[PDB]
RNA sequence: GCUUGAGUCUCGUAGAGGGGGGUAGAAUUCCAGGUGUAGCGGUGAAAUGCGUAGAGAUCUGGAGGAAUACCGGUGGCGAAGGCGGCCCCCUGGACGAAGACUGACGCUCAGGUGCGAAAGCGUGGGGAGCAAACAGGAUUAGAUACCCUGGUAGUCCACGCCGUAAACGAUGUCGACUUGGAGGUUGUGCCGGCGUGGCUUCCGGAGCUAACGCGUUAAGUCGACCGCCUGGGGAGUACGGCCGCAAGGUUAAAACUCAAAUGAAUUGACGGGGG
């Protein structure tokens, strides 16, 4: 888990670069099985993606 | 009768029935075949095969159009995705890109019950 | 008091409104005794996904302590002004200086 | 719940100190406060059974401290009651 | 043939013709549960 | 009196806990328009149905309701029922660290009271999708079914009622004690390790169990209090009472009848179970 290792405090919506290593081509949140994320930041990181799906600073999916 | 030259190849590949319809990039059809319209009814409709020849079917019905280039769009389940678009390269387009433009809800509406069969 | 940070998309013919959009919000806001820890202009971005068939938005990015009241007043003033295509309010724990990653 | 200020307060006028937390007339002011605090949010949310049940808990145990209260000290019962304006 | 192969394999990934089977009749919540649970001692099991 | 049970305070943490309000994107349906032309849809196969009055397909715009893909997890939270997009407002509980405080304030609880899935009921809304009833098409010896095409209540909202579910861990609550191993989740101390809490899984020892199994989350070893059982059927029925708008719920017999009914496990045989 990057986060843990970094000790990141909250995933930011805004931090658009770090969450796009987290969503699949078709806009997909990536399992925390695959990415390695631990579960703590692996929900901030969800709401994170939600957050930024909502302001258009990310795709919810690959054919809008 | 007039010309485009890039148009898109829409699959429509449900479990029954393959419809192939080739628009231009507006989305203004040009032509369709289907698989149930190729010869084909019932058990034999639902086959790779008979949307091959829906496909061979569907680039007969725009020759006059002189299309080149397909962008292909497939939408659904059906048997008849991927023999479609090897259809189309036969036939002579240019496949310059393939979409799964296959409708997901992002939850939606409630679905049919099972069947009990 | 609280922490809230905001986050509102301008249409991008009402970019050349955005200053006097801020001026105006921040005025409204330290009006009330509140403070604006952080203000960003991040300008003109592409969208994601088309809103009301534009492909483009003006965001600003405010990080502000205020009283519940103002808070409330300025997402009412976001629903009217039909310039603000969409806005986002989240408290946040503690106040927010620093840069954001835009910038 | 009551604020920091709020809790402090009452801790003042009902204790012995402000480490006085712990006596019987600070708990039963300061669920009294909780419990006439929430009766705006009950006004408004009166399907909010799950944060009901929370404040049935302040009150079922406010009246343990009070009976407790009670039968240690009748005459610190009587004061509280009449400070906090409850029947009993 | 390389570029079909490659639109096969992006679908596999994204899970597209899963994710339509699964929509197809609708699962009740103890159904959904039931089929979890059962994944979850299957995949136990395989440890 | 005491502080060890039980509480209070201080700082912080995680959470689909609840109530209210707002909003987003995907999709279905419908409406209108463009392109286009003979099919579509459906099944085991069909047919009903839809379509030249132009469907289906495809594109554009609009309307509306409902649900929130991915994240997602023997993951989390909640007394249980349950709770899942995002945002705000109001709000309940849990947990940890270190310390202070109260001083047995506790546990259990008949009656009582509250909460209580889904269906159902009342009034007023709403109605996309789904769908009891219903209709038609099949299938069949028949087919009041399963399958297909439709489709109304209902599902949704507000408020009120109902009070039941295999409402299940088929396991009452509280406390104490009794070898281990491997995980998950959520705190925390110290220096990637080493500890120490909460919650939660799998396996298993003693012990227990009819057996199956349970096994520190006990079905072990004990204590407190409550609920409940006493052969099968008749019957959770009748009658009466209470409750309910009703549907019904709840409390709850008897005659009569049988010599069984039952649980677990064993060997076969059998399966339109698997290999
Ligand atoms: C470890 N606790 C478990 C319990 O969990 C339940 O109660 C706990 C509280 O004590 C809760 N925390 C939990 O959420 C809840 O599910 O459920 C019981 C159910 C019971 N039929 C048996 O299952 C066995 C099966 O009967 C057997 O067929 C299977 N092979 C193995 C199972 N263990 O033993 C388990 C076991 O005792
Ligand atoms: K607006
Ligand atoms: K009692
Ligand atoms: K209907
Ligand atoms: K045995
Ligand atoms: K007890
Ligand atoms: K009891
Ligand atoms: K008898
Ligand atoms: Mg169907
Ligand atoms: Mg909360
Ligand atoms: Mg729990
Ligand atoms: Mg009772
Ligand atoms: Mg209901
Ligand atoms: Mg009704
Ligand atoms: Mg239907
Ligand atoms: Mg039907
Ligand atoms: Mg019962
Ligand atoms: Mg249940
Ligand atoms: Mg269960
Ligand atoms: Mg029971
Ligand atoms: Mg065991
Ligand atoms: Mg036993
Ligand atoms: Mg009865
Ligand atoms: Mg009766």
């Known amino acids: 888990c990057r986060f843990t290792a970094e ?7 805004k931090d658009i670069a770090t969450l796009k290593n987290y ?42 | 009768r007039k010309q485009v030259s890039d148009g898109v190849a829409h699959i429509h590949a449900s479990f029954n029935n393959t419809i192939v319809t080739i628009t231009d990039r507006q989305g203004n059809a040009l032509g369709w075949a289907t698989a149930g ?7 034999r409709k639902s086959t790779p095969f008979a949307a091959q020849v829906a ?19 497939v939408k659904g389940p059906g048997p008849g995705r991927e023999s479609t678009i090897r259809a189309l390269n036969a036939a002579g387009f240019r496949i310059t890109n393939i979409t799964d433009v296959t409708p997901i809800p992002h939850x939606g509406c409630r679905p049919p019950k099972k069947r009990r069969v | 008091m609280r922490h809230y ?30 403070k604006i820890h952080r203000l960003e202009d991040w300008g003109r971005r592409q969208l994601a996904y088309p809103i009301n068939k534009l492909h483009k938005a003006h965001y600003v990015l405010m990080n502000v302590e205020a009283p519940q009241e103002v808070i409330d007043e300025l997402e009412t003033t976001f629903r009217f002004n039909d310039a ?3 806005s986002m309010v989240m408290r946040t724990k503690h106040a927010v200086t620093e840069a954001s990653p835009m910038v | 719940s009551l604020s920091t200020e709020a ?41 909010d059974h799950h944060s009901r049940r929370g404040l049935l808990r302040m009150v079922s145990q406010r009246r343990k401290l009070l009976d407790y209260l009670k039968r240690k000290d009748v005459a610190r019962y009587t004061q509280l009651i009449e400070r906090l304006g409850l029947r009993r | 043939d390389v570029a079909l192969r490659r639109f096969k394999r992006s679908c596999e990934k994204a899970g597209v013709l899963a994710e339509v089977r699964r929509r197809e009749f609708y699962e009740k919540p103890t159904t959904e549960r039931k089929r979890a649970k059962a994944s979850a001692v299957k995949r136990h099991a395989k440890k």
């Open chain 2, 55 to 73: 496909a061979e079917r569907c680039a007969d019905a725009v020759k006059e159009y002189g299309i080149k280039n397909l962008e292909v769009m």
């Open chain 2, 37 to 43: 319209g190729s010869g084909f009814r019932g058990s």
């Open chain 3, 5 to 34: 940070e905001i986050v509102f998309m301008v249409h991008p013919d009402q970019s050349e409104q955005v200053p006097g959009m801020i001026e105006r919000y921040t005025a409204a806001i330290t009006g009330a005794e509140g």
């Open chain 4, 7 to 47: 809790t402090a307060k009452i801790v003042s006028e009902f204790g012995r100190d402000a480490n006085d937390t712990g006596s019987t007339e600070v708990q039963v002011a300061l669920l009294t406060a909780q419990i006439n605090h929430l009766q705006g949010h009950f006004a408004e949310h009166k399907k």
């Open chain 1, 23 to 64: 969503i699949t081509e078709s806009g997909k949140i990536v399992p925390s099985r695959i990415t390695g994320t631990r579960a703590k930041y692996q929900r901030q990181l969800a709401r994170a993606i939600k957050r930024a799906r909502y302001l258009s600073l990310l795709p919810y999916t690959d054919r809008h």
């Open chain 3, 84 to 86: 603000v295509i969409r």
């Open chain 1, 7 to 13: 000790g990141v405090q909250e995933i930011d919506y």
